[model samples]
Target: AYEGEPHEIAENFKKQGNELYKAKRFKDARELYSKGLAVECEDKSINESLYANRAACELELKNYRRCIEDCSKALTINPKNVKCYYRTSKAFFQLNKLEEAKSAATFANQRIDPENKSILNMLSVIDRKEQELKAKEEKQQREAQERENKKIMLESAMTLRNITNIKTHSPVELLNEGKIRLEDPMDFESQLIYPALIMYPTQDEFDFVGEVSELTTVQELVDLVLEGPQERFKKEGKENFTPKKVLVFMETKAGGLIKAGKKLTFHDILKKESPDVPLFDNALKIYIVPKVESEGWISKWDKQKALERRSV
Candidate 1:
């Protein structure tokens, strides 16, 4: 009705968004916030909370204008929201909009609890610089905006860089209604075919998005990084396979191809790949690997097996 779905449908995403915010993982929070907004556009709490979170993230990231924009939108949704006002004042201060800063600080003064010394001190500083802030747009607005853009770009680049840096991950699936098994390899995937379901940690009755499970965060994903013998053949010690490509396979529910930090799987890694990277087709790998299993996923391709076959 609103844009994407309903609040009832987005509960999973909203919970995820909130967790990401608490985790201090601002870059990833943006996408989750969008999902929440899609599900509950009219929910003022969700809207204000989303913008507040994004604004806080932008401020931490030093993108003053972006922080201002987000906080301003949050303010529009809930006029007199203290968090939005506080954050907007912060952005203005960072951008050296002394007059705006003072104005924002003044707004806070009228509303924020008089006992909050932090807000009071900030207001004091802005009041001292009000004249300059009034004249801030005279020469530095474009440069300030450019500086903010640069910070946002840096955050984007960092995520992309990390995506490229991560290469070792495999498929995963839930073990039951709410449990998950991390780093599950293709050989183990079939074991789950008999109805392995993972109930997500989301607030919803049913999950449609991912949560910050210990197994699903970036740190856990790194810990489960693919550590196995290189897929090489016939070179000196290791055989050199010709431009070998791998297609990681995992079985998941309706949510499908989830974020790397949401499951014990590498689905996100695959989804994040660029076209230049060779296509990894599970269908193709099936032909080469053959579906006879019970062995550990990585161990199935052990050199000892190949050596045994060579002797025969």
Candidate 2:
């Protein structure tokens, strides 16, 4: 009953197609399908099966047009081939040919074993999706609006850093005090987490947006310097400003003012102000203490004096 060559050659191509398909080598499966199709173009078993396999590859590769084309040929060759129609409908749906997809799926349901649960489920899903899409079509549109102004703020701040040096402007008169830089946009995420902020007031104004009661924000920190200390010192002749701010947080990369005191953890992020940064860990560590708005004091850590916790 065989028309020409032995069936073994066609079986070889079919096996190859399966292996390639399993590996997700969609293009390779299509190649093997070509080989198998050449051997027996008219045999319903080989032709329809290869048709579905090739259509599957086209689908996976996002070649919806190619999938529909293959499914159409398969349907024309065997009008009752229900699987081909199901596949054709799905490919048509992916291509936004909704009417064609619905029509194909409806015909496929009548032709396929009506009890096939998978085919029924697939049709139901497509029907529901079509309804949702119609409802969303007018109200939904994709936008990729971007805010580009602040993208270069960090860059500008970095450039400003090179123009000036904070170490030389120390109020503590220390030979080389550490430096701090403010964010270009001036709104930092975590105060301690970001790079240190070494700055001086542009004018003689006082603001303390810090842990010390009156301090509120960075702008306030600048204001605190010009206002002088919250407390005053009386000298031989007149009242002198000998104000010292409470050390707030520690900076990690650079060390400062945890120097000499009844050492304890100190962290209480003040809320009730403009920013509501909550208090956190108070493990006494090295950080800058404002000796003056223009100068800083660092917490000096003597780990050797303390027991070793981490091993080398």
Candidate 3:
């Protein structure tokens, strides 16, 4: 029954909105503040407080851009509104607009209230965030630099050795995908070492040797494999798999397989002199087979090649 002027109605709406805000009903509070703004009250103070209050509700609702807009409107009405500046800073911070957040908070502290605890805390928070962001970016850049250096060194090493990778994708692709990696040359007579995979196809088992020097011998790698617990091999009926009894084979690019001499170095098999057998998929491919089963495995491969030939 209390029909009143625009200013009075707006003031009433502000009081109701404040109550809703205290109750943490931010959306309801925002609606009430908007209603007050629509009244077009002549009292500038009432309109400024209404805009600031609506901005506070928007901040709580995570409507950061809306919060900034309302805060800006409040500041235009009353330029010295410290709370409106603080709200704008908070909105910018929530939006990850760190520079804008810092600017607004710094201005509030310097021009409005030098002793404002909230403004001081916001500034410190912004400082910590900026430092964290900078640190993360630096870490990423360092990792990228390491990767690039490794790639360059690996390519140079391959070129120096006259080694050719026969894969459709270059060695750099494997390095980037982390399928293979380089070892520090300082630890190995200043020679680049590469990762090698040893496959026991008969047993459907495989072992990864992380640092195989180019000068490493097939017999040396075979010795390392057999030196491990023989239970897995023994279970596979490879009881006679000794370094000498183990037959090593390298598959050619044309699907034919060739025997690799046990005494031959990895470099010997991979060098340009051995053009028929090249590195596959950017890594050395060797098959370790039991001497007793070598004949049967080779025959199977021969049969598969015969079938391919017939199809062609």
Candidate 4:
């Protein structure tokens, strides 16, 4: 049996590939184009068409990188191939490579008919995408800068007030976690707010207060805590947690507990010259104990502090 010429065989494969592509059998169409490419046809035009046709199939199949690769191959064989550039641009756009997409669309526009609607439309779409990408990047940068400035302001405010921040992690990490952050319009004169964790040790539960103003009084916070549902404190052993019957205590830097007067502001307790009540892990750590249960908890804390001191 006589074998057909390489170009003839490649042309047959190209025709079959075109039919499969029209049928939307992209994988089969790509295989046919691959066979055409493997034929080693001496005709450069045939090879270029094979790569370009395969690229179209790859694009339809959402194989964006492969489509770009095939389009590049086609362009190597025929630099003036407007269809290849258009397809490459589409592939880049799908991959979110906006700059590359714009370049390819521009190249396609340069080579195509002036009134070609497809390339013209694609150019506009690329322009819109470029604008959106730039705007998104700018927003991200602005947000990051705002966060940094807020962190700096918060740090300086704490320093000015003689409030110590006992941080085991970076402030950026705490800010990102929503664990510690500056209040909006962060100004020292307005007083900074902090994330505060209020623990009801007797009830074995906790409440997270998003923002506690440094000027907030212990009595004010205790009132807010008691304003919530009382089911948690209604248990038999934990019944004494009314606004008037709860006591707030802060763990001293020396590991001992210091009772906070209900009339004293958070700033009053935290901004002491020696700063025994430092912010723990970037948030205010306070234990709210019922008056009746306070003695046992305080005794336990005292024992733990004594043990630690003896170990040291």
Candidate 5:
């Protein structure tokens, strides 16, 4: 075992190990380096070199974990060792620890010669691999979203199918009423596939009104109301007065009313202006009224308010 040999014996082992390494006999060279470590009387520089040399042998042998351990040991003695970072990065890359590989290679490049080919090559390879991994993750997310969309569609269809008294519509009736705009008409489940009734209030009573898709729009409802027989809703006892102006309101299942201020969809009513508000039940209704009704009603209340103001 050459246990008590001169220091020259360890020096001789170093020389033999380098020769075997040059000949690509990595296993034999690793053994020689191991022997040198045992014989050398604990010199930091020699021990560091021996560990690093054995790590190179382990790399070629595909013993990546062993290479990483030996490289780490070499670096413990000399933290600035370029070969330690370079070799460790290669081990991490082979182990599919892409981010760790990129970090180590970056450190190696920073501290080593700018033209060091090994670290430069590893940096480029890691960047390419990172891009591939990101693209793969994005593709998986898209597939998951598609599956979720299909489930929403199936649930919506089942809900609509269970309503036995639902009215059927011909193609023309479906086309003129409302354009889809629900939870998101583009979203299959959010779509209102069947047409339903919208009641427009007249002077005497509400009439069996026009049809609308579940995801109908405010403007469409306005048009449907305006296009009705104008004489039928004429203001009571006022000739040539059918209130050119109309406003739309949604009747919530909770017996509350929501005025449509601007262009909005029926689904917006369901969502409320904010998601925190409780949603109305699915059996909601919409009605249109003359904007002039409030004009007449406000005048009656206006006299009552004038007396209150004077009393104050």
Candidate 6:
């Protein structure tokens, strides 16, 4: 290699780093730029350019915080370095320092004769991102308030239950199944009280549905309601044996109603309507009322059976 000044050698290293950076080899370029800095160039402009180029490489590598520092150093050496400001703004935007990014980009915009597209773009991105973050925080705050109301409702629901002594007599293997000790089993003979009797005077009511340890669905609840009363209907040889329309109304902790449907689970319903909200009690008084309609009301299960009959 031909002998040159230390500043010239540093410039050559910076040139090599720039080529590597253009080829998208950011890590390699960063190392080269670091080597250029280590050479300790006496030229002010050359050193400033080296710092800006290294900052760009660091930005590409997502070393955002470090990129900001390098860009700041470059700007300090050459106050008119517009590209350094752009890189600094970009790094600040990535770091979620929106105000800093906006400030830096605005200063760059003011200095340029023709508005810089890159600087304008960064400003636009900062504005949009800042607004989005603010909206998200506002939504979170509203949800937090809703959670407090749910907590109060949950306490009210829990107090209604008559839970007594719980005896855990399961083996390790059986215990893995996870039992919910709602109340003493023998104490629950038939104490399922219906609160919504004013709305449904003649509707069939079930209480103490008991510890449903397994994942229960809306269909399962319908089946439970049908199984109990259908036996009596079968014994009596009643006309219109199956229920025409069955509705299950459960009061959620958020004071929302779970609309009557089949197949979907309680968890699924809650997720759709009121996400992260709780059901009132472990075993909420779910009113299962069946109506006998002759004219046009068709049961969903009966409709399914009709389709199957046609298909066959």
* Candidate 2: regions farther than 4 A off: 1-6, 40-42, 138-312
Q: TM-score: which candidate is best?
A: 3
Residue-level lDDT of model 5, residues 1-312, one tens digit each, is 535654667777888899988999788899998988887565788788888999999999989999999999898998888888888998999999988898888877876666788889999899889999899999999989976776567456534433212122322232344422234533545555333334454455343333356456777756765565655655563332232466665433233345664376655555553321121112334455667664443333333332232212
TM-scores, one per candidate? 0.38, 0.41, 0.78, 0.68, 0.48, 0.53
Candidate 6: segments with Cα more than 4 A from true spot: 111-114, 153-281, 284-312
lDDT (0-100) at residue 299 of candidate 5?
Answer: 39
Winning model by lDDT: 4
After superposing candidate 4 on the true structure, give the runs of residues whose Cα lies further than 4 Å from its correct spot: 5-7, 38-48, 63-80, 165-184, 194-213, 216-250, 257-265, 279-312
Candidate 5 collision pairs: none
Model 1 regions lying over 4 Å from their true place: 1-5, 111-113, 127-312
Local distance difference test values of all predictions, in order: 0.48, 0.50, 0.79, 0.80, 0.63, 0.60
lDDT of each residue in 119-150, candidate 3, tens digit only: 99999999999999999999999989977777
Output the better candidate (1/3) by lDDT: 3
List of clashing residue pairs for candidate 6: 192-207
Estimate the TM-score for candidate 4: 0.68
Ranking by TM-score: 3, 4, 6, 5, 2, 1
Better of 2 and 5 by TM-score: 5
Q: Write the per-residue lDDT of candidate 4 for residues 14-38, one digit (tens) a residue.
A: 9988988879878888999999999
Q: Per-residue lDDT for 212 in model 2? A: 28
What local lDDT score does residue 215 receive in model 4, on the 0 to 100 scale?
Answer: 84
Q: Write the per-residue lDDT of candidate 6 for residues 1-312, one digit (tens) a residue.
A: 567588988988989888887799799889898888888877898889889998998998899989989998898898888898889898888887888888888888887533778888888888899889999999999999876765555344334432211222332232234323322222333222211111221323223443442236767755655554433333222443343465555444333344545666643454443422332322233445444532222222243332232212
